[PDB]
Design a protein around this ligand. Structure first.
Ligand SMILES: [Mn+2]
Ligand SMILES: [Zn+2]
Length: 1617
């Protein structure tokens, strides 16, 4: 015995920490025998691991291995007959359990699967336990390795190695040996030959149902003869009988059909867009009311801001009293202002911020004066001490920094207040809930009122976006049919002119859709403008884009300048259409505009589908879509009412109408409703499966099928492969005929198609699935609650303040009332609700840890007795089954033992329930207190094969597999949706194991396709070839067929791919071995038997509960057969985006076969390009295009015989060819302006102003690449700059991209336009010229002569002033030049680091060049809410120094001192002595200009040193240009070169935070092309400055390489050389 004897001596270095350790060690050491040794060794290992894991959580180790019922019986708990469960550790305290089960899994797959299966089994116990007993916190402590705190982490690996050596040495079955071995390794792809592949007496039926007719060896002449006969039959039995699928256009017929479907004539709506739409009407009213027509105000705004700041601290632990106190302060200061200066209450208020009988208050609230004084009247007489102590409480244990010297303590003089109140009479708002047209005929206004309409729309949209900003946890003082007289309504203001302002009143807070009321105020007289209903988070696009849209509309109008008289009739209607789309955002408008695009495509060409017009019509609702549909259809009929092809100008009309049709990108894509979208997604997923008739209900999820399930699966598979070549009744049904597949495969095998199997490079080299997209899943919620409760329990070594909430905010958002407020204000409304639920759960758990009903007047008998027995616990008890009034009156129960007198904020344990109940009773929240009363009322009331799978045994590991499973699951999936503009797309999310298998098959298919040629899906070279071929074919005038295939996802089946792969051979490159595709076929079978989990929300909505087949199916399977369906397994799914490359390969093979057939039959030359969903076929025909209809119909028929049905959107013609949304016309390419403009105006994802500027720069570069304009990009630049400025960051010299740019986005990077912006700041370019000359001198000195080295780097990191003065003295200067250059300064807020700010992110969580390099080494949220989070987070203590402070505090330290050099660019550039008070936030702009110039010279040549010289065309002649850059930095610039110089210069930064996960340092250390020419200094500059980003541009591609521009802009460019 070599290792057996050593085993006893090796464990001698063990600490007998516990009694059980020694108790088992004495048994171990005194017992040596091969049969019992291994079992007790495993037991000891697992025991020590679990003991350490639990003792990390203050466990009470379960040594007797007893159930939970027995341990509840040991203490005093009634037995509710719970399921029998053995927990690893239990801890009873008070009336709560802490149950934890631990395990160890080396690989992530088993770790995740075990974690899910253990969390579910613990969670299934709490429903039964809480019904008649205690509530438990479940902990699951999983470890990925065996390390612990009891051993030195050196003995465990050695003992495991020797133990597995013993196991593999001596034995005593088949798979248990392999499972023991597999569970002890460390780390461990295809070639799974270790598997067993045991049959099940079922897969044979699969064999003769899938492979009964596949041979793949047919000869060629027989195929030719059969195809000839088939064509002869089709000519005279299907085509001449009118059963085709494609038809000629007949322009007049299409125009009549469009006019009949779009322009409603059966509708009662009038032809005035303003009258039908509410928002449109309000915009019109405000515009035409405005167009045709003092230090106290600053003091009031400042004190209002101070009041908001003091209210943000919530230092009163109550909501009513705080609001009353702030109201008292505001009214006291109002009477203090109005006591003197009698011309104030009517001058700077009626023209400022006040309305009829209402004053603005804290928290953006507007309150009536009479109600305010009435509420202040209360709390007096009963609490005379209410004021004084409050005045005394703001000085002690308070910030004690308040300017309320007299406005605070002052008792409000009610006589003067009531005098002010009676000075003006009631004109309260009305808030209209739930007719002669006088609208001045929009077509007949001047060119000035329209821009005013756009400006008004922008202002109102900004007001809505700001209405989103109100704090969610705010309640009104007094709460509230068709008309309601407002008294405590929220309001927002928007300015229009000197006197009149606009108010926007609303009553609710959050992101939901509301009803707003718009009022005006001219000179104190408050009028009514209107009331409407909208969702605020859908109005972000027009927030400032009042000039971008005007610019694009003017350009599109100018596009029609070939007829003076057509643009005059199409301009105003186009503007009205754009404005109507902006004011009426909905998905139906998007769908209609997409239908318009497809109609245009069909109209331009010559052949189109017979079932096209049925895909254009979208039903109209609310009469707000009828107006936009009428406008769009009228535009289309007014434009394309002429002939086709042969015309003086037709390409311009097509361009204009295509751009009009992409107006649907203006409307956002953000799911108007989430539950509705989930329901629609589930419907779209499940309708075809049940229509086909093969959808089974809940399987076993273990690889076991009953006789009925396998029978229905086999029947479905037979029906799939039961189509004949002759029948025409099945053209739209899924299924593939075996004969044509045999023909295609046999013809592919004998190298006859354009592709063949001569492949090289041989290919074989914890989210819960039933809710996806939910902000916080059940698993995360329970984990968080358990963690918080465990931390609380271990801290109590009771009493508990509210600071516990702070703890929760550590785990939701990643990072002391300031910290709590900053963390709280970063949560969205739904996240706030989830946080409140977690709060309640934790508080209830602790209250339980700490340890009357005959109040019947209208309930208890039927209300709460059935409400508690209703859905789960009262934590989800709806407030609608019980009325509000009865809730309030039932709460009138007196104070008793259930209550306690006093708020008692400190709250010692044992009174949590009573304390929260009393506190919530004091405030307005009554239903929460009712729930608390409910919960306090207790109204919720030696074999080695089976006895070894309990401790750490990885029983669920893959060892043997069958045809339907792998003994490790059934390849579970999930359902979700991905937003698009037209309609949402399916999305399948998979577990880890199924993700690995899909990745394996995906890699194999990707390799096989990469061998082939004609696919263009993940190979840009083939896409470029397709683009060039399309361009030349359209130029020549050949036939182009754009084929978009319908239902590609939910139709194809893994069985089709199984048959195709069974019939293929895929010959090896140089071996000709006929690769065996066994593993691929096994994985494809596993896909064939996959499981898709239905969303839990859809099940709940259909259970609780308009006709739909999905709903009737769900009810039919509800209890008629079994239980609620939760899993759906079927034949034809091919999860969308799961088998993408395999589908591409199949489509390529079938398309090549079809092209061969067309060449064989009609003697044409087809060439096809496929992208796995859409394809383009370019057909060159010998020897006017109406005799090719038969060929097109035959092609469609043959495609339908395979599983490749053609959608009606497909078009065949000769005018325009489409592929991947890139339309080509004879001569040029269509620009698609509006798509790019709408993209630029959208996706404003802001985290820092610099990053926002960079993203907008990239988007604008891509925009100007496709010939948009140079007058539109400036307006987007202004919009981004104004969005930055409005956020409070203040304007900065760098900021967003430059204003007033030129065509020179080409041959210029981000640095060049930064340099241009700085040069534009200085007018006479004197100091800029001097710095440029110094830069040229330094550049020449480093290029030749006195060649320098890394010594210069030592100067860069010192600072800004020192670096500039050192470089000036190196070039050569004196004190005068240095002291003159260092005069210009700009304020750098991020001087001592970065802005401290938290954004609206998702829950559960150094120079930037390091982060970019780290990113290179490796491998749902809306826009308005994100921007509001940005603006709100940049108003708190953000900038750091020394400590944090505001931005306005820093900017208030500057002095005006406008002497000579602070007026060339106000609020941007200052002089030195003007920044004496704030000097640490002051850096020279000339240093950044110097760095920009040097870096630009390093990158794109030396021509950036010269001086700019200004030079001494129908706006429609486009032409293409190339970049004209010259580089001097070894342009190839491969990888592993920057890191070499960084290691040379910054070893400490290379060692730490850089390359931990790096395994090829040998190449990067052996001077791999080290010591570059300029890279020594051209990398240090970016390390210090945060807005150059030259490294990120070094290792990238231009991404455009071409720019289409105008003759108008190239002649206005600036010459610099
Ligand atoms: Mn297409
Ligand atoms: Zn009207």
């Amino acid at each position: 015995d070599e290792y057996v004897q050593e085993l006893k001596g090796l464990i001698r270095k063990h600490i007998p920490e516990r009694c059980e350790f020694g108790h088992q060690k004495v048994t171990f050491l005194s017992q040596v025998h091969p049969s019992p040794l291994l079992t007790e060794g495993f037991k000891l290992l697992s025991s020590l691991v679990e003991l350490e894991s639990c003792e990390a959580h203050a466990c009470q180790a379960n040594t007797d291995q007893r159930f939970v019922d027995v341990i509840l019986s040991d203490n005093g708990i009634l037995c509710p007959t719970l399921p029998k469960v053995i927990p690893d550790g239990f801890k009873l305290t008070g009336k709560t359990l802490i149950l934890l089960e631990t395990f160890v899994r080396v690989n992530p797959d088993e770790f995740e699967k075990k974690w899910k299966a253990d969390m579910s089994k613990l969670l299934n116990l709490k429903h039964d336990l809480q019904k008649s007993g205690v509530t438990l916190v479940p902990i699951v402590d999983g470890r990925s390795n065996y390390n612990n705190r009891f051993v030195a982490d050196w003995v465990i690996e050695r003992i495991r190695w020797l133990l597995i050596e013993i196991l593999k040495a001596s034995k005593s079955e088949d798979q248990e040996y392999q499972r023991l071995i597999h569970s002890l390794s460390n780390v461990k792809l295809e070639n799974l030959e270790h598997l067993k592949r045991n049959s099940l007496d079922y897969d044979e039926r699969l064999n003769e149902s899938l492979f009964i007719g596949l041979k793949g060896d047919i000869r060629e002449s027989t195929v030719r003869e059969e195809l000839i006969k088939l064509k002869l039959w089709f000519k005279d039995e299907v085509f001449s009988k009118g059963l085709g699928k494609f038809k000629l256009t007949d322009r007049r017929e299409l125009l009549e059909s469009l006019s009949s479907l779009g322009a409603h004539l059966d509708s009662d709506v009038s032809s005035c867009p303003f009258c039908n739409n509410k928002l449109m009407e309000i915009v019109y009213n405000v515009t035409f009311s405005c167009v045709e027509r003092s230090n106290i105000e600053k003091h009031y705004l400042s004190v209002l801001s101070l009041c908001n700041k003091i209210k943000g601290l919530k230092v009163f632990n109550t909501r009513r009293n705080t609001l009353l106190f702030l109201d008292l302060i505001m009214v006291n200061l109002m009477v203090d202002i109005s006591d003197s200066c009698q011309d104030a209450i009517e001058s700077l208020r009626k023209s400022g911020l006040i309305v009829g009988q209402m004053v603005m208050l804290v928290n953006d609230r507007v309150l009536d004066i009479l109600e305010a004084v009435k509420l202040i009247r209360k709390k007096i007489g009963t609490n005379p001490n209410w004021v004084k102590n409050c005045s005394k409480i703001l000085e002690r244990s308070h910030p004690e920094i308040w300017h309320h010297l007299s406005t605070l303590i002052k008792q409000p003089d009610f006589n003067s207040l009531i005098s002010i109140a009676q000075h003006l009479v009631s004109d309260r708002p009305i808030m209209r809930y739930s007719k002669i047209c006088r609208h001045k005929l929009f077509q007949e206004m001047s060119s000035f009122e329209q821009m005013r309409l756009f400006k008004t729309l922008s202002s109102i949209s900004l007001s809505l976006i700001n209405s989103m900003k109100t704090s969610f946890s705010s309640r009104l003082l007094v709460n509230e049919f068709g008309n309601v007289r407002l008294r405590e309504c929220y309001a927002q203001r928007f300015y229009l002119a000197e006197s009149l302002v606009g108010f926007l009143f609303y009553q609710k807070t959050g992101e939901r859709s509301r009803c707003y009321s718009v009022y005006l105020s001219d000179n104190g007289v408050m009028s009514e403008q209107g009331s409407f209903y909208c969702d605020p988070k859908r109005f972000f696009l027009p927030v400032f884009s009042d000039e971008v849209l005007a610019g694009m509309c003017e350009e599109m109008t100018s596009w029609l300048d070939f007829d003076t008289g057509l643009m005059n009739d199409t301009g105003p209607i186009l503007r009205l259409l754009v404005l109507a789309i902006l004011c009426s955002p909905s998905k139906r408008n998007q769908t209609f505009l997409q239908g318009l695009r497809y109609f245009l495509m069909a109209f331009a060409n010559q052949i189109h589908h017979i079932d096209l017009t049925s895909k254009l019509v979208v039903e109209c609702k609310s009469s707000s879509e009828v107006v936009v549909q009428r406008l769009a259809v009228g535009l289309f009929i007014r434009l394309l009412s002429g002939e086709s092809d042969a015309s003086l100008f037709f390409s311009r009309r097509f361009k204009y109408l295509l751009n009009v049709s992409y107006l649907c990108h203006l409307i956002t894509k953000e799911t108007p409703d989430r539950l509705t979208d989930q329901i629609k997604c589930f419907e779209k997923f499940i309708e075809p499966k049940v229509k086909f008739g093969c959808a089974v209900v809940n399987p076993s999820l273990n690889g076991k099928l009953t006789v009925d399930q396998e029978d229905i699966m086999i029947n479905g598979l037979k029906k799939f492969f039961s189509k004949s070549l002759r029948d025409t009744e099945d053209v739209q049904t899924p299924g593939v005929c075996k004969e044509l597949l045999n023909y295609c495969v046999s013809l592919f095998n004998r190298g006859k198609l354009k592709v063949s199997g001569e492949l090289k490079n041989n290919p074989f080299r914890i989210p819960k699935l039933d809710e996806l997209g939910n902000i916080l899943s059940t698993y995360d919620k329970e984990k968080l609650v358990s963690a918080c409760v465990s931390s609380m329990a271990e801290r109590f070594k009771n009493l508990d303040p509210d600071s516990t909430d702070y703890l929760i905010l550590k785990n939701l958002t990643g990072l002391t009332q300031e910290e709590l407020s900053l963390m709280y204000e970063a949560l969205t409304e739904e996240q706030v609700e989830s946080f409140n639920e977690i709060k309640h759960d934790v508080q209830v758990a602790l209250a339980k840890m700490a340890d009357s009903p005959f109040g019947v007047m209208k309930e208890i008998r039927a209300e709460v007795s059935l409400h508690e027995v209703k859905d789960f616990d009262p934590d989800v008890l709806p407030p609608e089954v019980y009325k509000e009034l009865c809730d309030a009156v039932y709460k009138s129960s007196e104070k008793c033992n259930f209550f306690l007198e006093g708020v008692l904020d400190v709250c010692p344990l044992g009174l949590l329930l009573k304390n929260l109940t009393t506190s919530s009773y004091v405030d307005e929240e009554y239903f929460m207190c009712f729930k608390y009363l409910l919960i306090q009322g207790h109204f919720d009331q030696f074999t080695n094969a089976a006895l070894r799978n309990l401790c750490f045994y990885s029983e669920d590991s893959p060892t043997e597999f069958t045809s339907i499973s792998s003994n490790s699951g059934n390849l579970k999936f999930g359902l979700s949706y991905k937003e698009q503009v037209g309609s949402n797309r399916e999305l399948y999310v998979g577990d880890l194991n199924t993700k690995l298998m899909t990745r394996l098959v995906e890699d194999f298919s990707e390799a096989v396709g990469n061998s082939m040629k004609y696919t263009c899906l993940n190979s840009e070279k083939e896409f470029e070839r397709a683009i060039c071929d399309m361009k030349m074919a359209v130029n020549n005038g050949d036939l182009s067929c754009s084929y978009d295939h319908s239902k590609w996802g939910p139709t194809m089946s893994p069985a089709l791919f199984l048959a195709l792969l069974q019939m293929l051979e895929l010959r090896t490159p140089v071996d000709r071995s006929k690769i065996d595709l066994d593993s691929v076929k096994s994985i494809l079978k596993w896909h064939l038997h996959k499981v898709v989990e239905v969303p839990i929300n859809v099940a709940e909505a259909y259970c609780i509960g308009s006709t739909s087949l999905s709903e009737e199916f769900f009810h039919q399977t509800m209890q008629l057969n079994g239980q609620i369906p939760s899993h759906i397994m079927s034949v034809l799914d091919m999860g969308q985006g799961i088998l993408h490359n395999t589908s591409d390969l199949y489509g390529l093979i079938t398309e090549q076969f079809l092209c061969y057939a067309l060449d064989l039959l009609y003697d044409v030359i087809p060439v096809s390009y496929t992208s796995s969903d859409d394809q383009i076929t370019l057909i060159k025909t010998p020897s006017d295009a109406a005799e090719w209809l038969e060929m097109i119909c035959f092609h469609e028929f043959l495609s339908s015989k395979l599983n490749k049905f053609v959608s009606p959107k497909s078009v065949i013609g000769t005018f325009v060819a489409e592929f991947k949304s890139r339309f080509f016309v004879m001569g040029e390419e269509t620009p698609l302006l509006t798509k790019f403009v709408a993209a630029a105006l959208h996706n404003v994802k802001c985290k820092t102003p610099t990053q926002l500027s960079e993203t907008i720069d990239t988007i604008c570069d891509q925009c100007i690449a496709n010939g948009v304009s140079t007058k539109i990009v400036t307006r987007i630049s202004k919009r981004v700059n104004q969005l930055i400025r409005y956020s409070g960051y203040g304007e900065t010299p760098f900021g967003a991209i430059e204003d007033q740019d030129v065509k020179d986005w080409v041959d210029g990077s981000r640095g060049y336009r930064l340099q241009r912006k700085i040069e534009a700041i200085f007018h006479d370019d004197k100091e800029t010229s001097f710095i440029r000359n110094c830069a040229r001198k330094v550049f020449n000195d480093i290029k030749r002569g006195r060649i320098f080295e890394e010594n210069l780097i030592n100067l860069i990191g010192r600072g800004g002033d020192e670096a500039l003065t050192g470089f000036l003295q190196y070039a050569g200067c004196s004190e005068q030049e240095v002291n003159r250059v260092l005069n210009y300064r700009w304020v750098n807020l991020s001087s001592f680091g970065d802005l401290r700010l938290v954004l609206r992110t998702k829950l559960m969580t150094v120079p930037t060049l390091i982060k970019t390099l780290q990113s290179k080494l490796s491998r749902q949220s809306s826009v308005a809410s994100g921007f509001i989070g940005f603006c709100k987070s940049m108003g708190s203590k953000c900038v750091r120094d020394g400590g944090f402070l505001y931005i306005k505090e820093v900017y208030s330290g500057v002095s005006a001192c406008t002497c000579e050099i602070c007026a060339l660019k106000p609020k941007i550039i200052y002089c030195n002595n003007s920044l004496n008070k704030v000097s640490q936030f002051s850096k020279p702009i000339l240093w950044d200009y110097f760095s920009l110039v040097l870096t630009n010279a390093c990158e794109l040549g030396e021509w950036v040193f010269s001086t700019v010289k200004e030079p001494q065309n129908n706006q429609n002649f486009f032409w293409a240009v190339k970049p004209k850059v010259v580089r001097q930095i070894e342009d190839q610039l491969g990888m592993n070169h920057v890191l070499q110089s960084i290691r040379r210069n910054y070893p400490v930064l290379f060692d730490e935070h850089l390359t931990p996960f790096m395994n090829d340092l040998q190449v990067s250390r052996t001077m791999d092309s080290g010591r570059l020419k300029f890279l020594d200094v051209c990398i240090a500059l970016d390390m210090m400055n945060e807005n150059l980003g030259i490294i990120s541009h070094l290792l990238k591609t231009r991404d455009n390489s071409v720019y289409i521009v105008k003759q108008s802009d190239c002649a206005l460019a600036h010459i610099r050389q």
